[PDB]
Each structure stands twice: as structure tokens, then as C-alpha cells.
Ligand binder design. Sequence first.
Ligand SMILES: NC(=O)C1=CN([C@@H]2O[C@H](COP(=O)(O)OP(=O)(O)OC[C@H]3O[C@@H](n4cnc5c(N)ncnc54)[C@H](O)[C@@H]3O)[C@@H](O)[C@H]2O)C=CC1
Ligand SMILES: NC(=O)C1=CN([C@@H]2O[C@H](COP(=O)(O)OP(=O)(O)OC[C@H]3O[C@@H](n4cnc5c(N)ncnc54)[C@H](O)[C@@H]3O)[C@@H](O)[C@H]2O)C=CC1
Ligand SMILES: C[S+](C)CC/C(O)=C(/O)C(=O)O
Ligand SMILES: C[S+](C)CC/C(O)=C(/O)C(=O)O
Ligand SMILES: [Mg+2]
Ligand SMILES: [Mg+2]
Ligand SMILES: [Mg+2]
Ligand SMILES: [Mg+2]
Lengths: 339, 345
Amino acid sequence: DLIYQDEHASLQPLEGRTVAVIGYGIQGRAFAANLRDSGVAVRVGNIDDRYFELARAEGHRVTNIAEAVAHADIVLLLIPDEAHGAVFDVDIAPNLRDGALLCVAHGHSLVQGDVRPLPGRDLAMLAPRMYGDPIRRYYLAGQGAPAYFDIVADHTGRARDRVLAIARAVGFTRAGVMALGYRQETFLDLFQEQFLAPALVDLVETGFQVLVERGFNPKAALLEVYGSGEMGKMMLDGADIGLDEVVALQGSPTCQVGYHRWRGRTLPTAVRELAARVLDQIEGGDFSAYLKEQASNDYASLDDARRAALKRPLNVAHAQVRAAFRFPTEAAGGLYQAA
Amino acid sequence: DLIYQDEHASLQPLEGRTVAVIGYGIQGRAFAANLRDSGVAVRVGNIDDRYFELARAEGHRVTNIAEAVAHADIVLLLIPDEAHGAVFDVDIAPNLRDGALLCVAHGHSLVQGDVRPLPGRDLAMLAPRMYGDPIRRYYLAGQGAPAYFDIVADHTGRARDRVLAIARAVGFTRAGVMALGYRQETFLDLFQEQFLAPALVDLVETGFQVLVERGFNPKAALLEVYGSGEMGKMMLDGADIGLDEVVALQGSPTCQVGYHRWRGRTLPTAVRELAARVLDQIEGGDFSAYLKEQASNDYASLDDARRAALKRPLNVAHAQVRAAFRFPTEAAGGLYQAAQAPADV
Ligand SMILES: NC(=O)C1=CN([C@@H]2O[C@H](COP(=O)(O)OP(=O)(O)OC[C@H]3O[C@@H](n4cnc5c(N)ncnc54)[C@H](O)[C@@H]3O)[C@@H](O)[C@H]2O)C=CC1
Ligand SMILES: NC(=O)C1=CN([C@@H]2O[C@H](COP(=O)(O)OP(=O)(O)OC[C@H]3O[C@@H](n4cnc5c(N)ncnc54)[C@H](O)[C@@H]3O)[C@@H](O)[C@H]2O)C=CC1
Ligand SMILES: C[S+](C)CC/C(O)=C(/O)C(=O)O
Ligand SMILES: C[S+](C)CC/C(O)=C(/O)C(=O)O
Ligand SMILES: [Mg+2]
Ligand SMILES: [Mg+2]
Ligand SMILES: [Mg+2]
Ligand SMILES: [Mg+2]
């Protein structure tokens, strides 16, 4: 494996260059904020929506996407994946300067051919393994989250150092930036979203529902399965020292004996089988077809799913617990303004 | 529900009283540290092992258990649950002053009858919903983790305000301290440890195993299922705003569409049926009998299981990833030393 940390990257390739951040969403806002604080010239390209106004409110040079691209040496396409094709064809490809670098943060539009190499230009993936708020918070604490990168097309022969310069400016090299093919990244990322995340929340919810059914205090049931923060602390500490090691170090002997009674014994064969079926849906194009249908509406079906999830017993209990118990938080106002 | 925060508790009941922390392990160290920093007279009772020397290194007044109890108004029994019976019979019961309060941090020894009410004395549970390091880190940031409490025996009639005074001094009232019966706490706590924690790690491990079998880069597989910290951040942010809400707020539309394709649909009935089986084993005494067997030869079988778990593919991959990728950590050196705060803090 090729893994790049700060010792393996430099801001030198960004000297005298302008980065156009296309989109000012979860990733775009974090990239724009960290690039600016790292002393990189940055401008934002965005359509006429609330994100345009937010970028203006946070002191950025904001224009339509075509104008941002026409005035940029490096272009980061940080909008939803189903929107890449139309924005690439209409706004990006006609305005991308000779020798300019275009980056995506997910392989999906590359796999589908909605973003393609252009003669005379560079194309890459820099895919963070983290959502925006923590990328921003880590950055300000002198920390970073991991990322994967791939050099898809390199006309200039300088794409690798320019991609890794962006990665250093945004903080990912403080953890590590590993070479991984855009196709593998696509399938791996979608697998985490479609198998692991829903199975994890379904498992937490199953614990909650069995306890409430069996006559346990619903607030206490919600607190134990995640609401206390304990199970989240175990998973985040586990990223540092190992999940079994969190139990060995931090668990009472009562806890450790119970945990090891059931470790490797809790799940039916159906879980491993579902994992394989989800990968079949991803690798074979079935999920990509489903996503295209879901987007064809401005995501009307997703809006209905989001609203329905808030009515589930776990989420009704969440609101009751959160109103009754203070959770440790840090103030987020002004997080994305200039340091 | 009865939920106490800082405005429902005071340190007044600890004025002129001494707290004996019995044990200096995961909970004992956090209780002793937070009590000292809250200005409470605290001493540590411990056997002759490494924890005695750690308590001394960290600046505490340390003695054997009998001596600590004989000189205390409030006694916190923060040693492993299977050890409560012998220590209670030999060291605590003969030395507990008239009107003293004994507290446990888990209901198990009360359920088993290894710790019992004593004439003229108070007995309570104060059970943190968190392990020691976060209790300590939260305390130093002016924050706390939740706890459950129960008043089991109240000779004095002042047990409730003394238990909540301890909870305020240690930080739990900054989140909330809720009344919950010691028997319910026991079964609920053991259920989290025996169903939920191993099922969560088994699921992460299953994701890792299938990805490696299907030809994915093992470091990348390990990072996505937990190693990046992303899934832990989602669970911890989820504690604040809700788990479905984290996806709605922080997920790309691609992520949200994929998540909601399977949300509420991933698990067959065998999972909730196994959860009920674990609860049956807990409620009916089967786990309690297993625990007593396992505590034989000082938990020899658990030592074997711990060592064996380090060599599982997930943990071999963990070591490879953690050597290749830097993870954001905060320095832990001196975390449990006295923490004098400057004017700005
Ligand atoms: N959300 C995350 O934390 C991560 C996302 N990514 C990738 O980063 C990229 C950005 O995703 P997010 O930041 O989550 O998206 P988002 O949902 O936050 O995107 C909002 C932004 O997209 C723009 N936008 C939306 N529809 C548009 C359209 N039709 N035409 C032009 N602009 C449009 C909005 O104006 C706004 O600036 C995606 O390729 C995603 O897969 C990868 C790593 C993590
Ligand atoms: N570990 C945790 O974060 C939590 C633990 N608890 C409860 O807190 C209590 C303490 O558990 P932990 O701190 O995890 O235990 P631990 O494993 O850290 O206990 C170590 C301490 O116990 C003492 N000890 C061990 N065996 C002994 C014996 N035979 N006689 C006398 N002292 C002995 C040691 O000298 C040391 O002071 C238990 O009742 C546990 O259920 C409840 C909430 C969370
Ligand atoms: C990793 S956590 C579930 C261990 C800390 C905790 O809350 C307990 O009840 C215990 O250790 O017995
Ligand atoms: C809760 S996390 C898995 C969402 C952030 C993330 O890593 C993505 O790949 C995405 O949003 O598309
Ligand atoms: Mg991702
Ligand atoms: Mg426990
Ligand atoms: Mg517990
Ligand atoms: Mg994604």
C-alpha cells in the first residue's frame, strides 16, 4: 500500500493557483474553510440556492459554477453524485483550462462515465473517510481524518503532487492518504452506507425494542443502546485501540465475562448473506439504477423515508431522552468562518 | 421518571463527611479523582496490588479496606461484583459506622444477596452509564455522563441527598441522574454487555470479513467498518441528535438513498429472538452462576479469551491500520492527578 502523511506532501504545488470548490454542502464547506485557513486561494461555484448565500455569509468569493471553473487551476466537484453528469457536460468541461485538475470525492460518477477524462487535463479522486463537521473540527485541532486517492488521468504529469497538496491543505495527510482505485472506493463506500450503517442502527433499535417490550424503562433502554454516548465512545475509542481492547481495558470483570460469553455468537448466517447480496446489488449496477430513479424526483421518496423514520419508537424515545438529559456538546456557531 | 440535575442536588450533605473509595480501578479512580477535585474529603481503601501503588502515585491517602471503612461516613464499593460478598462480610460490615452510607455502582451483588442492608446503616446504588476515562474527561470539561440511582435501605432518612451529593461531586447531575430499581439496572446493564456490545462488534467484524473475502483492500475494509472513526462519530453524534438524523444531516443524497433502501429491513427475527434468550439467561440466574464459575482461579478463562481475541483477523488488521494511519487522540498522562483550574477555566 502507498500511504501519504504530511512528510510525503507539500503546499508548494498550490503556490499561485486558485482552487474552485463546486458546491458548499457537507464536504464543500469543509474543503473551502480548511483551504482558506491553509493560505490557499479559494473561490466557490454554486447554483442559486441557500448554499450560495451561506458561502457569501462565510466571506467566500461566490459565483455560478461556469465562472468559478473558468477562473480555477484545480476544480473540486463537491455536489451530489447524480448531479455530476449535467454539471460536468454544461458547466465544467467547456470551461476547464488546459492543464487544470478536476477532483471528485467519490468514484461513482467515474464508474458510470458521467465524469470522464478530458484531453489536456488531469482527473483524480480524493475521497475523505469522514463527514464535514469532524473534518473541520479535526483541522482546527491540528488533526485530520483518512482519505483514499486515485490518479485517473494525468496529462500534466503533476496530478499526484497537486491532489496530495489539496489533501495536506484540508488535513487528510495528518491521518494518512492511501492509493485506492476509484471503482473499489465506490463499491466499498456504498457497502458501508447500505449494509453496515443500517444494520448497526437496526441492531441498536432491536436492543431498544426488546428491552421496552420486556418492561424496561424506555428512557433507560434508549440510554443504554446509544443515548448515553457509551456505545459511541466504545466505537470511537475502538478506532484507536481495537474494539475487543476497549472491553479488556474499560470493562468490569462482570462486563468482560458477559461480552466474551456471546462474542462471535450473536448473529445469524443471514447477516453475512445480506452483506454479500448488498455487494451484488452494488457491483452489478442495481443500486446505481435505484439511485437514478430516486434522484429523478429531487429525491421525493427519500424525503418521505426521512419523515417516516422520525415517527419510529426509537426516535420518539430519543426526543424524550434528549429533553430530559443534557448531552456534552461544543458550540458550532462560526466553525466555518476564517481562523 | 425522577431525573436529578445540578439544581436538584447540593454538596451540603458532604460537609464534614469523609468518603472511602473501596477500589481504585476503572470506576474507583474516576470517583476518587472527581471527588478530590470537587473539594470532598476522600480516602482510598485497597488490597496490596498495583492499584494501591497507583492511588499513592496519584496523591491519595491509601490504606487497607477495613481501615478506610472504619474512618468513613460514606463507602463506595468499586471492586468487581463477584468480590463484593467476601469483602462485605470480612472488611465492610464489621467496620461500617452507625448512620454510614454504603453505595454500589451495579445492582448485581444486591440481587445475589452478597451485599445486604445492615441495621442502623444506609444502602444505595449509584450506577454510571459510562466507563471511567470519559467520566473523568467530561468532569474536567464541566460536563458529565448520566447515572441511575436507587435507595435500598435508609435508616438515617438522609440517604437520597447523600447519594445525589456524591453524584453532583462526580459530575453525573450535569447530564441527569434517574431513579431506577437496582434489580432492573442489573438486568439492563448485563443485557447491553451480553447482547448489544458483542452484536455490534460481531456486525463490524462480519462487514470486515465479507469485504476481505470479496477481494477488497483489508486496510480500507477495516477503516470503513470502524477504523476511520466515522462509524463511532455517527454513534456519538447520534447520542446528541438521533441516528437517522445524523444520516439526514451529514450524508450525501447517495448515502441517504442507500441507507434508507435497507433501514429497518436488515435483520431477520433470529436477532430479536437471541436478544430475548440473553435476557432469559440474565433474569433467571444462569449468567450469575456462569460468572461465579468464571471468577475461579482469578478469571483464568477470561484471560485466555482476551489473549485469543487479539489474534482474530479484525484485530490483526487493526494493528496494521493503526501503525499506518495516525488517529486523533488527547494526551492521558496525569488525567487522574489533582486538576487545579485557572481563572479562564
Ligand atoms: N457527505 C459527506 O460527508 C461525504 C460526501 N462525499 C462526496 O462528496 C460529494 C458532495 O457530497 P455532499 O457534500 O454530501 O453533498 P450535499 O448534499 O451537501 O450537496 C449540497 C451542495 O450541492 C449543490 N447541488 C445540489 N444539487 C445540485 C445540482 N443539481 N446542481 C448543482 N449543484 C447542486 C448545492 O448547491 C450545495 O452546494 C459527493 O460526491 C459525495 O459522494 C464523500 C465523502 C463524504
Ligand atoms: N467498569 C466500568 O466502567 C463500570 C463499572 N461499574 C461497577 O463498578 C464496580 C467496579 O468495577 P470496575 O471499576 O470495572 O472494576 P476493576 O476491574 O477496575 O476493579 C479493580 C479494583 O478492584 C480491586 N479488587 C479486585 N479484586 C479484589 C478483591 N478480591 N478484593 C478486593 N479488592 C479487589 C482492585 O484492587 C482494584 O482496586 C463494579 O461493581 C462494576 O460493576 C459500573 C459502571 C461502569
Ligand atoms: C464498554 S462499557 C459497556 C463497560 C463499562 C460499563 O458501563 C459497565 O457496566 C461495566 O464495565 O461493567
Ligand atoms: C454517516 S457517513 C457514512 C456519510 C459521509 C460519508 O462518508 C459518505 O461517503 C457520504 O455521505 O456519501
Ligand atoms: Mg463515505
Ligand atoms: Mg456493567
Ligand atoms: Mg454499564
Ligand atoms: Mg458516500
